[PDB]
Amino acid sequence: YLPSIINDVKLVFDPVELSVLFCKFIQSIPDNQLVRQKLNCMTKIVESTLFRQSECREVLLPLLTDQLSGQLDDNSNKPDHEASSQLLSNILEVLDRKDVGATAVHIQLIMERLLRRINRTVIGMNRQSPHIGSFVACMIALLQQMDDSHYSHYISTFKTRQDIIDFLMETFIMFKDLIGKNVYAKDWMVMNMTQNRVFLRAINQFAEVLTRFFMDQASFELQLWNNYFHLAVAFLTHESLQLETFSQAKRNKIVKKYGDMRKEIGFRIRDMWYNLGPHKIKFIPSMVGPILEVTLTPEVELRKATIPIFFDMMQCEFNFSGNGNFHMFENELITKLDQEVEGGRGDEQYKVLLEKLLLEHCRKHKYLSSSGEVFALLVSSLLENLLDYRTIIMQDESKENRMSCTVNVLNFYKEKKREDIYIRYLYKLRDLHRDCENYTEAAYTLLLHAELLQWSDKPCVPHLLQRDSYYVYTQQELKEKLYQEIISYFDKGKMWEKAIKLSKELAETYESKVFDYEGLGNLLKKRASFYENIIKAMRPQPEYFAVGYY
Amino acid sequence: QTYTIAVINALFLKAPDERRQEMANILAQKQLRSIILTHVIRAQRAINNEMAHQLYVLQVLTFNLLEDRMMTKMDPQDQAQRDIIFELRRIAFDAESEPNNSSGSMEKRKSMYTRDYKKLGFINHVNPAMDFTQTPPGMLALDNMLYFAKHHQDAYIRIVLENSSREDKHECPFGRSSIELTKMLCEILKVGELPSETCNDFHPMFFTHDRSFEEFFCICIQLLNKTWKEMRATSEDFNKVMQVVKEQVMRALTTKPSSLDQFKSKLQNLSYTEILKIRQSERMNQEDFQSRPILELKEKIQPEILELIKQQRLNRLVEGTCFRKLNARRRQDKFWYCRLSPNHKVLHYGDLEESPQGEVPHDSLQDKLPVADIKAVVTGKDCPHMKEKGALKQNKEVLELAFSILYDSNCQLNFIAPDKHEYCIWTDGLNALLGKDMMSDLTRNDLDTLLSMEIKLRLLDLENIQIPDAPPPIPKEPSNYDFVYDCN
Amino acid sequence: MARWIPTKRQKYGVAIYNYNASQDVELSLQIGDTVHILEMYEGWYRGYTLQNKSKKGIFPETYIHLKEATVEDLGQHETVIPGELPLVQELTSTLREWAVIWRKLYVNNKLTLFRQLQQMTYSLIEWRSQILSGTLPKDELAELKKKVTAKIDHGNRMLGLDLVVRDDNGNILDPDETSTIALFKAHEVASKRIEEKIQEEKSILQNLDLRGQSIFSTIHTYGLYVNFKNFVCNIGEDAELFMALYDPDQSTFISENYLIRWGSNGMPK
């Protein structure tokens, strides 16, 4: 009840004197006592006579900052969290009201003693049990209420370069934690986009500070862009045209009140990367993967602005394809396109605009452009194949057409010798046949997969593995596993000659390569059983009908 | 329990009815009602469709055990019944009737008849027992009022003295209310009717008492007095008012409560709005269309919304329900289904064991209907398979569950449904399947609201304004055909 | 078609009824359409429909309906009671979106919650109508506004639709980047309204004793309604009616009586 008098005390007293008197009082609390209650006291204070800011701000906010900073890490503060959040809430709420006077510097101080502080605090509050949203609020309010002037003033101007880089570690990792697994129930579209707005602005400011202090001029210690670009992309990867579509005006809503963030985010990305200059070669195999999800956003503008970035990175790699090629880009490029476009996110006009831009790039530069031209043809083919594939996939359910198209693209990949997605679709096929309950053809697919593998005791490649199960896996272990289910299929396929043949080679491989005689016996006695089935069982003869298409 | 209860039904099938009452008394002395209540009326496993049949048929057993004693006529010359009603309306009218007319004269009896039936709406007081010769129900109305005089005496005498103030046409005839209500509720229940094996809906709210329908009638006659005072209706519309009221009581019954107390709640709940609520909620369409502007535009909306209705029925049928196989009373699986292919040019149908998951998508037993070739829907009786019914094999309600689309150009796809709204569903589904007009009562039932919704949302711009049918005069377009500021 | 004079006043109008298809961009358009009449002319004004701000039509002033409206709630005063024009205009917008979504709530054969949507829809149109009858005093409008926000957020919840803000006078007026903390406060208190609303819907969904408890627990100023019609008895003298209150338990009485001169034959003196 002591603060409950201050508003009328001021009316008959020196407000500064009252303020410092309360300061002298409260500062004297033995820290082992009555924490949350003294915080409530500070709240009841900060509500009132802080409207009379211009005289008591400079003498309380120091003190209040001190108490909160002490509250920062006392290792038992879990109930203190809610109360301290109330304090931050109320101080910022009063500081942002427009009838308070010049407060920029006082913010600046609150900033200077609590930014990384509450940032670390929420970095502790990562468990989704407490009132996370309160501190997330206080965070965003701190960083939007403040000004770029303040960052540049001293937040950019903290202590030693290594320390500030560690601080940046902290900020970017915790952001990337924020963009994923939003702490708000996603129903708070207002609040969610506000948070996106403020985070975007903060990231802009950090873009300037990175540019300022971490170019080739600071040739040293230049990895952070990993974290940066990853943050940018993960941010960029929601609030997409479907979401704004959900009303005609929903689009118009997010546009009018906010614009479409993606454009400026991508623009910052692209010119950040341009300014990166002579070191992009350190990024291609990594960062090609991210930049497609921006490349593939259903809009037109930033897509048109973005497409050239692939060309820029590949021709920079041409500066390193003076020795060799740029394949050590296009391989993973293609791979990423495969995953994403099969995910269901491409467009045909995407490839059209692609064609236009890539052709611009080719018809600018010399002979490497001819190479890139034929590779652009490869990319085209790739696209329209995936496009037709997808458009058929989820509509007819005609397993015949599904098999037909997937094997079309499998054949194409075979021609383009991309064994990896080859295998991917081969396993898609085994599942497709399983759901069709067709066994001979499923076995046949399994074979043509297996026949890539050889009988060398060297586990040459893990890339050939599907990512389901792997330990050391000398190739023969996988080959014999494959054969186990293959012969299982040929059994349940009720066709045997190929089965007994595969038994022949599996048996010889056992006997003269691994000497696992139990397996020898098992498979050979099963082969004998298959022989007797051949004789005893009946074989119906399927009839062959010729089907023209016209 | 299905087996044993159906055996009990069998004991009730071909026994002399007096020995039906003897064995009914045996059941009551064991109180089979309550023991069945605690065991299987508390069973929460897959309660048999044969339980559906058993509950219905046991209700019918009770019902006919009342029927065989009610169809006969209580003679209006029964001096025994003269004494019976004498003491009954003693304990009823003993507030207007002295306790002395127990020792009194038949002359005071006739005077009490005339006064208490000019206050309870009877036209004759020299032969008062004339209204006792129409069964439904006859005597059981007197049994009703007996048992009410035994138990509900407070509200009983309250009825007796509350009818004692209105001598205009707002007076309610307890005798005539009783006869009317009892016979027509008998008809709504179809009390004591022949075995209908397709009746799989039942009345647990009366599996919980022995005089359940008696006390039901009294609680609903308090409902009656409430309803009379709801409209303040005269006795000229006595038949009109109470027919409407029992329409509402049918609504309350059809809400299907499974407890007596919940239906008492419903006796409270049915407001005078319910008397008019939906029966006039079908009319907002016609007030909308009485003026042209709603009327004159709506006629282009239907293809959108009729398409919606038909295609919604289609989407229902794509999964589809499981019909019943004809006369599989000899322990054959009745619930056969028919799947509507997402292609909708073929059907997938057959009979299996009961599937609480609905239909199992599989290439069914016989798996075809050429939608193009198959043409004619024999809507109900027109099925040649059941065209031979006389009146006993099929009656005039199964064809509202049964019909066929032809098939093979020779044979019928005989149909059955658990109920009739989904009969409407399947009908208009197959109906749309040919590009031909919708013939479900629910179709013309639900266009209104959805059409009403579209028009009301379309008129969100036209509030507190007036328009006539006559359009305003039309100015002319001058020949400066390009803009100052061009398009876009 | 030339001679185009613009003014922001006209950018928002509607039509009287169906049009005619005499010319090309003059087709028999719909009855009520907020159209973009950007520019004005002698005989026919421009029009860019709600459904396409770019689709063209030169419609006549005569067939412009009673709407020269604008985004200005002040000018024509066909925005009769400004400030509540917001609430009603987003009221209309949300009703349109509700109708759209439940239109495809058929295969969501949720006829239960579908029909509650229709109930809320009728309730909403009649509520808005009463608001358009804005002759009412201020407290009624306040309480109506509060329960309107309630029903809107209700629907958006079960419909899986976004939350609105700004408890008072507009449901939206926050976006002004007023205060992220105030924004959080509004969001949290409204969300609490949301879960408490779901649980009070389940409360009021089966039995309705708790509503009696609540309504009789807010304010406790009660009186006893002696809904007397007739006295069923006869004493012969001026029998005098004295009601009163007594606790069977506290062994003490509560209120005081009232004399009623009832007559000597069960009639009133």
Author numbering:
A (entry chain B): 819 to 1368
B (entry chain A): 240 to 727
C (entry chain B): 1 to 269
Question: How does the study describe this entry?
Answer:
The dedicator of cytokinesis (DOCK)/engulfment and cell motility (ELMO) complex serves as a guanine nucleotide exchange factor (GEF) for the GTPase Rac. RhoG, another GTPase, activates the ELMO-DOCK-Rac pathway during engulfment and migration. The DOCK-A (DOCK1/2/5) and DOCK-B (DOCK3/4) subfamilies specifically activate Rac and have an Src homology domain at their N-terminus; the Src homology domain is involved in autoinhibition and binding to engulfment and cell motility (ELMO) scaffold proteins. ELMO is structurally divided into two domains: an N-terminal domain (NTD), consisting of the Ras-binding (RBD), ELMO inhibitory (EID), and ELMO domains, and a C-terminal domain (CTD), consisting of the Pleckstrin homology (PH) domain and proline-rich region.
We initially determined the cryo-EM structure of the DOCK5/ELMO1 binary complex using human full-length DOCK5 (DOCK5FL, residues 1−1870) and ELMO1 (ELMO1FL, residues 1−727) proteins. We next analyzed a DOCK5FL/ELMO1FL sample crosslinked with bis(sulfosuccinimidyl)suberate (BS3), a widely used N-hydroxysuccinimide ester-based crosslinking agent, achieving a reconstruction at improved resolution (5.8 Å) that clearly showed the ELMO1NTD density with two-fold symmetry. To enhance local resolution, we symmetrically expanded and refined the particles, focusing on a single DOCK5/ELMO1 protomer and the dimerization component, which led to structure determination at 4.8 Å resolution. Model building and refinement of the DOCK5FL/ELMO1FL complex were completed, with the exception of the C-terminal region of DOCK5 (residues 1643−1870), which remained disordered. The structure of DOCK5/ELMO1 showed a closed conformation similar to that reported for DOCK2/ELMO1 (21). The α-solenoid of ELMO1NTD was clamped onto the DHR-2 domain of DOCK5, occluding the Rac1 binding site. This indicates that the DOCK1−5/ELMO1 complexes likely have autoinhibitory regulation in common. Despite the common closed conformation, a detailed structural comparison revealed that DOCK5/ELMO1 is more compact than DOCK2/ELMO1, with the two ELMO1 NTDs located closer to each other. A closer interaction was observed for DOCK5 than for DOCK2 at the ELMO1RBD-DHR-2 interface, between Glu36 and Asp39 in ELMO1 and His1545 in DOCK5. The C2 domain of DOCK5 interacted with the ELMO domain of ELMO1 in the apo state of DOCK5/ELMO1.
